Amino acid sequence: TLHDKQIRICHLFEQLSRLKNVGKLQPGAIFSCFHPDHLEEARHLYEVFWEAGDFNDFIEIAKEARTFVNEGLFAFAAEVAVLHRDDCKGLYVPPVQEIFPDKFIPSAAINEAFKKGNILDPEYRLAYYREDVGINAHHWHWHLVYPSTWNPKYFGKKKDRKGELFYYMHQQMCARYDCERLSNGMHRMLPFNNFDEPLAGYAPHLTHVASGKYYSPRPDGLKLRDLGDIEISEMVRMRERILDSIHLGYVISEDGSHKTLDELHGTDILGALVESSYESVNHEYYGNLHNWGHVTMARIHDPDGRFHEEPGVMSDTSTSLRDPIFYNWHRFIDNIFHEYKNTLKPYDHDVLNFPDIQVQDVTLHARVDNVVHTFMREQELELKHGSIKAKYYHLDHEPFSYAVNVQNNSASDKHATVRIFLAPKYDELGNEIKADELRRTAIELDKFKTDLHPGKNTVVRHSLDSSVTLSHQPTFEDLLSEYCSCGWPSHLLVPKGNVAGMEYHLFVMLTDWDKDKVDVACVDAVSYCGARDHKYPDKKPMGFPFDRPIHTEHISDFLTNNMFIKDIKIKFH
Ligand SMILES: [Cu+2]
Numbered sequence: 001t002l003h004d005k006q007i008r009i010c011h012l013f014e015q016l017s018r019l020k021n022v023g024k025l026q027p028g029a030i031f032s033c034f035h036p037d038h039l040e041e042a043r044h045l046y047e048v049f050w051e052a053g054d055f056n057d058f059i060e061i062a063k064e065a066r067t068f069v070n071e072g073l074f075a076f077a078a079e080v081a082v083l084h085r086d087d088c089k090g091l092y093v094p095p096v097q098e099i100f101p102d103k104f105i106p107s108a109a110i111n112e113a114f115k116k117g118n119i120l121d122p123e124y125r126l127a128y129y130r131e132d133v134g135i136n137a138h139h140w141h142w143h144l145v146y147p148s149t150w151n152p153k154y155f156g157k158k159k160d161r162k163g164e165l166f167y168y169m170h171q172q173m174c175a176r177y178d179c180e181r182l183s184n185g186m187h188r189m190l191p192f193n194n195f196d197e198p199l200a201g202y203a204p205h206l207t208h209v210a211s212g213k214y215y216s217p218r219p220d221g222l223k224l225r226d227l228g229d230i231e232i233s234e235m236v237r238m239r240e241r242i243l244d245s246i247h248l249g250y251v252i253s254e255d256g257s258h259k260t261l262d263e264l265h266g267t268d269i270l271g272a273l274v275e276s277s278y279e280s281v282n283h284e285y286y287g288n289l290h291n292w293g294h295v296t297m298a299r300i301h302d303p304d305g306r307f308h309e310e311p312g313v314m315s316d317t318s319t320s321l322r323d324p325i326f327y328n329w330h331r332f333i334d335n336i337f338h339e340y341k342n343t344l345k346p347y348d349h350d351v352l353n354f355p356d357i358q359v360q361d362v363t364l365h366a367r368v369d370n371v372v373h374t375f376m377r378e379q380e381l382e383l384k385h386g387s388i389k390a391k392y393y394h395l396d397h398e399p400f401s402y403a404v405n406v407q408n409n410s411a412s413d414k415h416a417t418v419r420i421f422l423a424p425k426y427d428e429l430g431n432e433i434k435a436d437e438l439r440r441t442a443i444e445l446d447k448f449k450t451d452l453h454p455g456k457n458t459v460v461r462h463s464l465d466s467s468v469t470l471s472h473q474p475t476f477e478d479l480l481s482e483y484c485s486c487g488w489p490s491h492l493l494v495p496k497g498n499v500a501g502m503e504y505h506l507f508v509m510l511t512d513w514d515k516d517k518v519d520v521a522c523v524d525a526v527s528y529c530g531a532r533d534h535k536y537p538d539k540k541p542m543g544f545p546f547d548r549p550i551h552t553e554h555i556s557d558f559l560t561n562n563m564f565i566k567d568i569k570i571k572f573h
C-alpha cells in the first residue's frame with residue numbers, strides 16, 4: 001500500500017497507445033474480451049505477471065511487455081495482476097476512462113481538442129444510461145474480478161459462486177435498463193431469441209487513437225452470419241443442448257456422467273457453462289454461448305475479415321453496454337437462467353417469514369418525503385494520462401435515507417439482514433405489472449446487517465452507504481470499503497423516472513442474518529461485486545426473494561410480516 005508502489009503501478013498504465021508466447025495480437029488493434037484466441041494471450045500475460053517473484057520483478061517484465069504487446073491486452077492483464085497479487089494488496093488501479101479516454105468520450109470531442117445535431121431515433125433518449133462513463137467502467141472491472149478464463153487450481157483459490165454472479169450481474173443490468181425504458185415511456189426490451197432476426201443498428205462514434213481506426217458501426221438490417229471461427233447453427237445447437245439439460249434437471253459431464261442441477265448449486269453450474277468460463281462441466285458439448293454472441297454481433301459487418309474492419313463496441317467490456325443489442329442478447333441469456341428458476345418451486349412461508357419480526361412502516365426521507373429527484377449533472381474527465389479535460393453530463397439523484405420501523409416481538413435481540421429492492425408499478429401503457437413480471441424488473445438497492453433490540457426499532461440507512469455502489473474512484477492525479485474498482489455508479493443508483501413523477505415499489509425484506517451469514521476487503525459494492533478473497537457473504541440466492549416463480553397475482557398478496565412495500569415516486573428535472 002506504500003505510495004511508492006502506487007506511483008509505480010500508476011506509471012504502468014501511463015500513455016498506453018519468458019514473454020515468448022505473448023505478442024501475437026498486434027498493437028493498435030482492438031482487443032476482444034470475448035474471443036477465445038484473444039483471451040488466451042491475455043491469460044498468458046497475467047500468468048507471467050502472477051508468477052513474477054516479487055513486486056520488483058512484476059513491475060520489471062510488465063514495464064518490458066507493454067513496449068511490444070497490444071495495449072488492451074496489457075491493460076486487461078495488468079489489472080487482473082494488481083487485483084490478485086498479494087504484494088499489490090492495498091493498491092488501486094487508475095480509472096479505465098483515464099487510461100483510454102477515447103473509449104468513453106466521443107470521437108469528435110477527442111478530435112476537437114488534440115494539441116487543440118438533432119435526434120432521429122427514440123433509443124437516443126436512453127443514451128444517459130448506456131453511454132454512461134461509470135457504468136461502462138464498472139462492467140470492465142466486474143469482468144476482471146470475475147474473469148471467464150479463471151483457472152481455480154492454478155491460482156490455488158476459487159471465486160465463489162462466480163457462475164451465479166455472472167447471471168445476477170447481467171440480469172440486473174437488464175432489469176435496470178428496462179426501468180429506464182419504462183421511465184422514458186418505452187416498452188420493455190425484447191429478447192433476441194430467433195437468431196435469424198435482422199439486428200437494429202448502432203453507430204458508436206468512438207475512435208481508437210492508438211491506430212487512427214475506430215469501433216466499427218453496424219447499420220440497420222444485417223443478420224448474424226458465420227465467422228471463420230464459429231457458425232451460427234453451432235450457437236443454436238449450444239442453446240438446445242442447454243434447454244435440454246434444464247428440462248431434464250441434470251447436466252452431462254465430460255466423462256459422460258450426470259451432474260444434477262440441484263437448488264443449491266444449479267444456477268452456478270449453469271452460469272459457468274452458459275457464459276463459458278473455465279469451470280464449465282463440458283465445454284465440447286455446451287460450448288461458449290454468451291461469449292460467442294458478443295463475437296458474432298461485434299464482427300457482423302465483416303464476418304470473415306476481408307474488409308479488415310475492426311470489431312464493434314460489443315467486443316469490449318468497456319464499451320458493450322453502449323450498444324442497444326447488448327440488452328437484447330442478455331435478455332435472451334437471462335431467459336435461459338429464468339427457464340431454469342421456473343423449474344424451482346415457489347418459496348414457502350417458512351423460508352420467507354422471520355417469525356417474531358414485523359416491519360411496520362418504511363419512509364424514504366429526501367426534501368419531499370417518498371419522492372426521489374433526479375436531474376442531469378456535468379462532470380469533467382482528465383485526458384492527459386491516456387489533450388486535457390472534456391465535459392459531459394450524467395444522471396444523478398438527490399441524497400436520501402430510509403427509515404424502517406421494525407417491531408421485534410421477541411424477548412431477545414435479533415440480528416437481521418435488510419434487503420431493499422425497487423420495481424416499477426406500471427408499464428408504459430399504464431398497466432399494473434403482476435408479481436411474476438416484477439421478478440424481471442426489480443433492482444437491488446441495498447443489503448446490510450442491522451441489530452434489532454426487543455419492541456420498537458427504527459432503522460436509518462443512507463443512500464450513500466449502498467452495498468450496490470462504488471463510493472469512491474480516485475483519479476490518476478489522486479494516486480499521483482477499499483481499494484478495488486468494481487461497483488455500480490453512485491449517480492445511477494435509482495432510475496430517471498419522469499417529469500410527472502413515476503411510481504415505483506420500494507420493497508424492504510428483513511431475513512435472519514444467523515441463517516444468511518457465511519463466515520474482508522472490497523465489500524463496498526458487495527451485492528454486485530462480492531468480497532475480496534472471501535466468499536459471497538450471503539447464503540441466500542442472488543436476487544432473493546425474486547428468483548423463483550411467484551404464484552400470487554399482485555405482489556402485495558405475496559408479502560409476509562417481515563416484508564413491506566412503500567410506494568414512492570421518482571421525479572426528473
Ligand atoms: Cu459482461
Ligand SMILES: [Cu+2]
Binds near residue numbers: 290294
Ligand atoms: Cu455479456
